[PDB]
Amino acid sequence: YAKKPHISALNAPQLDQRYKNEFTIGAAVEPYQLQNEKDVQMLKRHFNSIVAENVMKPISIQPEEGKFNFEQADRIVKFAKANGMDIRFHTLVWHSQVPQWFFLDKEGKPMVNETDPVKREQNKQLLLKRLETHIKTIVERYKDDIKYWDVVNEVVGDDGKLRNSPWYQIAGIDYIKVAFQAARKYGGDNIKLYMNDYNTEVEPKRTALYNLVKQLKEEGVPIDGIGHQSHIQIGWPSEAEIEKTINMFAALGLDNQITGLDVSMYGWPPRAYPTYDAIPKQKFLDQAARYDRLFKLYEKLSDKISNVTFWGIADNHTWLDSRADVYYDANGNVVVDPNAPYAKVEKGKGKDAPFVFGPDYKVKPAYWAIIDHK
């Protein structure tokens, strides 16, 4: 409701306690935020699950072969343990924020360039060996502290084919199989292994993901759940399509986690307002009604969803701002209409507002829409 006041989130009813029998409530964080008093208070008050926005990605953990940097990841793990939070590991394998040394052959040349079939096969086995050592080292360190693992991220293309990353060009589908088998072998039966992706609701990617995981499980590849990034909009994807997607994977015996939820104010490609102040009130009411519907649906499906994680804490910090392109007409006025004329765009200079907490750490209408029982 819009009657409900814009109070400090540190005085508001706890979000994780509202949902504690339905699913955990998580947030993606940076270590610097554990030094910010407000962010610490926000995490202590409202969240019971945590994930690293960046410092557990492949390039952050092993930027050079043999050089492991766990310092930053350790800080997130320590904070979680001290506050009784679940931890998700994001992420063991990804085609982005991944060090290039992985994909160089013995002479330092890119493996993708290799044409000889015998050398190509040698490169596959070398890559798969490096992959296993990366996973082994990380999981040997964290298997007792981190329950949920994004083993692979974004391995299915939006075209419904496997994404043709260097991982896939060099090693084929086996890099996916090796990643899960290695995590299971070094982590044991008690860690939960996930395949994570965006637009899991969208054909042809959805059923390609479905076929992939169904085939892998049939071959004995250990995979326990699907991570739905859920980088969504006020109107897309539809709740019915979210519901159908989540039932589809639950029918395979898979857990579902909402791993990166944000509800952007904009379309795609976004035409953003240049500042938070410029976003009209009505956008916040539209977002709150979207959030109201969305969490009612998560509650409906709470037996198939173990965790809902936001990709951030409060509106003062969201990766969505890097997509918030501001369009200007010939008179220098801002253009937010997705079809209107415009002369220039300022990429990533605008402001999105995706969470239930505003940038001054006060509750948004979206918060009241999901803290109630209506």
Ligand X SMILES: O[C@@H]1[C@@H](O)[C@H](O[C@@H]2CO[C@H](F)[C@H](O)[C@H]2O)OC[C@H]1O
Q: Which residues bind Zn ion (CB under 5 A)?
A: 16, 21, 23, 48, 53, 275, 277, 292, 302, 372
Q: Is 89 in the site for ligand X (CB under 6 A)?
A: no
CA distance 344 to 66: 45
Residues 262-301 interacting with ligand X (rule: CB under 6 A): 268
Contact pattern from residue 20 through residue 39 relative to Cl ion, giving x for each residue in contact according to CB under 5 A and a dash for the rest: -x------------------
Which of 348, 185, 329, 357 minimizes the C-alpha distance to 262? Answer: 357
Residue written as tokens 């997509």?
Answer: 323
Q: Binding residue for ligand X (CB under 6 A) from 147, 231, 290, 304?
A: 231
Q: How far is the CB of 311 from ligand X (least distance, A)?
A: 6
Q: How far is the CB of 56 from Zn ion (least distance, A)?
A: 13
Q: Binding residue for ligand X (CB under 6 A) from 199, 257, 287, 309?
A: 199
CA distance 26 to 81: 14
Which of 141, 129, 127 minimizes the C-alpha distance to 186? Answer: 141
Nearer to Cl ion among residue 187 and residue 354 (C-beta): 354
Among Zn ion, ligand X, Cl ion, none, partner that 121 touches (CB below 5 to 8 angstroms by kind): none
Q: Is 333 in the site for Cl ion (CB under 5 A)?
A: no
Nearer to ligand X among residue 89 and residue 142 (C-beta): 89
Contacts of 365 (CB under 8 A, 6+ apart): 1, 2, 4, 284, 285, 287, 288
Nearer to ligand X among residue 53 and residue 255 (C-beta): 53
Q: How far is the CB of 25 from ligand X (least distance, A)?
A: 17
Number of residues that bind ligand X (CB under 6 A): 12
Residue written as tokens 């690293």?
Answer: 52
Which of 29, 12, 60 minimizes the C-alpha distance to 309? Answer: 29
Dihedral angle, C-alpha 130, 131, 133, 136, nearest 10 °: 180
Residue nearest to Cl ion (CB): 319
Nearer to ligand X among residue 105 and residue 154 (C-beta): 154
Residues 121-150 interacting with Cl ion (rule: CB under 5 A): none
Q: Binding residue for ligand X (CB under 6 A) from 198, 210, 295, 355?
A: 198
Q: Is 53 in the site for ligand X (CB under 6 A)?
A: yes
Q: Is 1 in the site for ligand X (CB under 6 A)?
A: no
Q: How far is the CB of 197 from ligand X (least distance, A)?
A: 8
Among Zn ion, Cl ion, ligand X, none, partner that 255 touches (CB below 5 to 8 angstroms by kind): none
Nearer to ligand X among residue 153 and residue 165 (C-beta): 153
Q: Phi/psi of residue 94, each to 5°? A: -160, 150
Q: Binding residue for Cl ion (CB under 5 A) from 319, 334, 335, 349?
A: 319
Q: How far is the CB of 66 from ligand X (least distance, A)?
A: 24
Residues 112-171 interacting with ligand X (rule: CB under 6 A): 153-154
State the residues that interact with Cl ion by CB under 5 A.
21, 319
State the residues that interact with ligand X by CB under 6 A.
53-54, 153-154, 198-199, 229, 231, 260, 268, 311, 319
